[PDB]
């Protein structure tokens, strides 16, 4: 699945961009998780943190969640509790995976905005 030469694989934490919304954190999933259909070549199914819904998104409309400060939207974060909830669940997941200990958002956000230290982006990988 997803053998199209384009970026991203199953389990990858990503920012995803669909019409009408800020960049939003998501996880790349298999089409079978979606009970929908196979993604068009060049595209990935993602499941969004916060609301748990699925979108089929172009691999060119996805970036690694690791590039955090570059896509974090501070205005959206201040404006929307749904975005703040989305950030928590996505960063929680980021934490567990990498090795990171530490309104409980604060040091998660700082750690994220700071570049996911000590581990770096490398510790965001799925397995």
């Amino acid at each position: 699945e997803y053998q199209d030469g384009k970026e991203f694989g199953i389990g990858d934490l990503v920012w995803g961009k669909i019409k009408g919304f800020s960049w939003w954190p998501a996880m790349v999933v298999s089409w079978k998780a979606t009970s929908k259909r196979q993604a068009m070549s060049g595209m990935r199914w993602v499941q969004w943190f916060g609301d748990g819904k699925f979108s089929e998104v172009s691999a060119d409309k996805l970036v690694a969640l690791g590039l955090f400060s570059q896509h974090f939207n501070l205005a959206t974060f201040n404006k929307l509790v749904s975005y703040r909830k989305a950030m928590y669940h996505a960063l929680e997941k980021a934490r567990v995976r990498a090795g990171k200990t530490f309104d409980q958002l604060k040091p998660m956000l700082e750690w994220a905005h700071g570049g996911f230290k000590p581990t770096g982006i490398e510790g965001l990988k799925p397995n």
Partner: peptide, 7 residues
């Protein structure tokens, strides 16, 4: 409240 996200 489930399924596919609507833009």
């Amino acid at each position: 409240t489930g399924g596919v996200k609507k833009p």
